[PDB]
Design an enzyme around this catalytic site. Structure first.
Site, PDB file in Angstrom:
ATOM      1  N   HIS A  83       0.949  -1.120  -0.188  1.00  0.00           N
ATOM      2  CA  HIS A  83      -0.127   0.047  -0.172  1.00  0.00           C
ATOM      3  C   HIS A  83       0.988   1.187  -0.084  1.00  0.00           C
ATOM      4  CE1 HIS A  83       0.158  -0.184   4.367  1.00  0.00           C
ATOM      5  NE2 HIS A  83      -0.233   1.042   4.428  1.00  0.00           N
ATOM      6  N   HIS A  85       1.456   4.010   1.978  1.00  0.00           N
ATOM      7  CA  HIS A  85       2.295   4.332   3.173  1.00  0.00           C
ATOM      8  C   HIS A  85       3.529   4.241   3.205  1.00  0.00           C
ATOM      9  CE1 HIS A  85      -2.122   4.543   5.488  1.00  0.00           C
ATOM     10  NE2 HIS A  85      -1.886   5.209   4.614  1.00  0.00           N
ATOM     11  N   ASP A  87       5.689   2.996   5.289  1.00  0.00           N
ATOM     12  CA  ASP A  87       6.234   2.055   5.809  1.00  0.00           C
ATOM     13  C   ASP A  87       6.583   0.700   4.847  1.00  0.00           C
ATOM     14  OD1 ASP A  87       3.423   1.474   6.286  1.00  0.00           O
ATOM     15  OD2 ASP A  87       3.798   0.044   7.579  1.00  0.00           O
ATOM     16  N   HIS A 148      -7.394  -1.462   5.585  1.00  0.00           N
ATOM     17  CA  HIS A 148      -6.416  -0.428   6.460  1.00  0.00           C
ATOM     18  C   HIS A 148      -6.242   0.781   5.248  1.00  0.00           C
ATOM     19  CE1 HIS A 148      -2.717   0.972   8.064  1.00  0.00           C
ATOM     20  NE2 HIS A 148      -2.000   1.003   6.936  1.00  0.00           N
ATOM     21  N   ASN A 179      -3.434   2.513  13.281  1.00  0.00           N
ATOM     22  CA  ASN A 179      -3.575   4.104  12.743  1.00  0.00           C
ATOM     23  C   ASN A 179      -4.489   3.638  11.417  1.00  0.00           C
ATOM     24  OD1 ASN A 179      -2.757   6.093  10.717  1.00  0.00           O
ATOM     25  ND2 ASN A 179      -1.262   4.407   9.797  1.00  0.00           N
TER      26      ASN A 179
HETATM   27  F1  LIG Z   1       1.121  -2.409  17.956  1.00  0.00           F
HETATM   28  C1  LIG Z   1       1.164  -1.538  16.498  1.00  0.00           C
HETATM   29  C2  LIG Z   1       0.470  -0.621  16.627  1.00  0.00           C
HETATM   30  C3  LIG Z   1       0.521   0.410  15.136  1.00  0.00           C
HETATM   31  C4  LIG Z   1       1.410  -0.337  14.135  1.00  0.00           C
HETATM   32  C5  LIG Z   1       1.594   0.515  13.153  1.00  0.00           C
HETATM   33  S1  LIG Z   1       2.937   1.383  13.153  1.00  0.00           S
HETATM   34  C6  LIG Z   1       2.157   2.671  11.691  1.00  0.00           C
HETATM   35  C7  LIG Z   1       2.657   2.138  10.678  1.00  0.00           C
HETATM   36  N1  LIG Z   1       2.200   2.571   9.453  1.00  0.00           N
HETATM   37  C8  LIG Z   1       2.457   3.834   8.677  1.00  0.00           C
HETATM   38  C9  LIG Z   1       3.279   4.828   9.004  1.00  0.00           C
HETATM   39  C10 LIG Z   1       3.794   5.576   7.963  1.00  0.00           C
HETATM   40  C11 LIG Z   1       4.705   6.675   8.138  1.00  0.00           C
HETATM   41  C12 LIG Z   1       5.054   6.726   9.377  1.00  0.00           C
HETATM   42  C13 LIG Z   1       4.225   6.266  10.522  1.00  0.00           C
HETATM   43  C14 LIG Z   1       3.474   5.281  10.396  1.00  0.00           C
HETATM   44  N2  LIG Z   1       1.462   3.757   7.707  1.00  0.00           N
HETATM   45  N3  LIG Z   1       0.631   2.810   7.753  1.00  0.00           N
HETATM   46  C15 LIG Z   1       0.940   2.039   8.784  1.00  0.00           C
HETATM   47  S2  LIG Z   1       0.410   0.258   9.179  1.00  0.00           S
HETATM   48  C16 LIG Z   1       1.820  -1.432  14.411  1.00  0.00           C
HETATM   49  C17 LIG Z   1       2.040  -2.157  15.563  1.00  0.00           C
HETATM   50 ZN   LIG Z   2      -0.463   1.871   6.324  1.00  0.00          ZN
HETATM   51 ZN   LIG Z   3       1.931  -1.041   8.315  1.00  0.00          ZN
END
Ligand SMILES: Fc1ccc(CSCCn2c(-c3ccccc3)n[nH]c2=S)cc1
Ligand SMILES: [Zn+2]
Ligand SMILES: [Zn+2]
Ligand SMILES: [Zn+2]
Length: 232
Positions: A83, A85, A87, A148, A179
Site C-alpha cells: 500500500h 504508506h 512503511d 487499512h 493507525n
Molecule cells: F502495535 C502496533 C500499532 C501500530 C502499528 C502500526 S505503526 C504505523 C505504521 N504505518 C504507517 C506509517 C507510515 C509513516 C509513518 C508512521 C506510520 N502507515 N501505515 C502503517 S500500518 C504497528 C503495531
Molecule cells: Zn498504512
Molecule cells: Zn504497516
C-alpha cells in the site's frame, strides 16, 4: 524464535525463514516516541528474489538489501509495495538505485503521489476491483477491497501456503485498531471475508507488524476492527 523489537537495533534488519524459499524481513522504526517492528516478505523466484514491501525507510531498506546479500546471496530483481504508506514504499528509491524493478497498483501509485511519498516505477494491472487476483511469478497478488487503506494488497505464496496480509491484518497481541486515518472501517470486515474465501488453505499468516500465526489472524482483525467501529 521470531525477532521482536528488543532484538533489533534500530537501523538493522533480521530475516526469518517461514518456509522453503520464503522469508519474512523484520525492521524497526521510531514513531511518536514508540518503537514498532515491521514485516515484509522475500520469495525465491528461481535464481532471483521477489521482495514484498520496503523496510520502512531508506536506511532500513539499504540494511535489508545488505542483509539479503549476506544471508541469501541471490539478487532482488523485483519488489511490490502493498500500500502507499511510508512503511511500505519508504526506501523505494534505494531499491531503484540498486537496480530493483519496483511495482505497485495504479491505485497505490496514485495515492503515494498525492501523499508525496516515494512512487514505485512499474504498475500492476488488473487489481482495481475487489476480489481481483493476478499472478506475479512465485506469488498471487490479491486486492480484497478497502481495509487499512483503499489500495491494500495481500500476497499469497501458493507453493508454501504463506499468506502475507500486510497492514490489513493485525497480529494477535494488537487488541486495538492501529493507525486508521486512511482506512475504510465499513469495508474492512468484508475485505477480510474475501481473503478468507479466497485462501482457506493458508497455513501461515504474516501480519504487517508483529508475530505470524494462522488463519485466525483474519478473524482477530475482524474482531478488533468491529470493536473500534463501535467505539462510544
Ligand atoms: F502495535 C502496533 C500499532 C501500530 C502499528 C502500526 S505503526 C504505523 C505504521 N504505518 C504507517 C506509517 C507510515 C509513516 C509513518 C508512521 C506510520 N502507515 N501505515 C502503517 S500500518 C504497528 C503495531
Ligand atoms: Zn498504512
Ligand atoms: Zn504497516
Ligand atoms: Zn523497470
Amino acid at each position: 524464535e521470531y525477532p521482536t523489537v528488543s532484538e533489533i537495533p534500530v537501523g538493522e534488519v533480521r530475516l526469518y525463514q517461514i518456509a522453503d524459499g520464503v522469508w519474512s524481513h523484520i525492521a524497526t522504526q521510531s514513531f511518536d516516541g514508540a518503537v514498532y517492528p515491521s514485516n515484509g516478505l522475500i520469495v525465491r523466484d528461481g535464481d532471483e528474489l521477489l521482495l514484498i514491501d520496503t523496510a520502512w525507510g531508506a536506511k532500513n531498506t539499504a540494511a535489508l538489501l545488505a542483509e539479503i546479500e549476506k544471508q541469501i546471496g541471490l539478487p532482488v530483481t523485483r519488489a511490490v509495495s502493498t500500500h502507499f504508506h511510508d512503511d511500505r514504499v519508504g526506501g523505494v528509491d534505494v531499491l531503484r538505485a540498486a537496480g530493483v524493478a519496483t511495482y505497485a497498483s495504479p491505485s497505490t501509485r496514485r495515492l503515494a503521489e498525492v501523499e508525496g511519498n516515494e512512487i514505485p516505477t512499474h504498475s500492476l494491472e488488473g487489481l482495481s476491483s475487489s476480489g481481483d487476483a493476478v499472478r506475479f511469478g512465485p506469488v498471487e497478488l490479491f486486492y480484497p477491497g478497502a481495509a487499512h487503506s483503499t489500495d491494500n494488497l495481500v500476497v499469497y505464496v501458493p507453493s508454501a501456503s504463506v499468506l502475507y496480509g500486510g497492514c490489513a491484518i493485525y497480529e494477535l497481541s494488537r487488541t486495538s485498531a492501529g493507525n486508521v486515518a486512511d482506512a475504510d472501517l465499513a469495508e474492512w470486515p468484508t475485505s477480510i471475508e474475501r481473503i478468507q474465501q479466497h485462501y482457506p488453505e493458508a497455513q501461515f499468516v504474516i501480519p504487517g507488524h508483529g508475530l505470524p500465526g494462522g488463519l485466525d489472524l483474519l478473524k482477530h482483525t475482524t474482531n478488533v476492527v468491529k470493536a473500534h467501529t463501535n467505539r462510544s
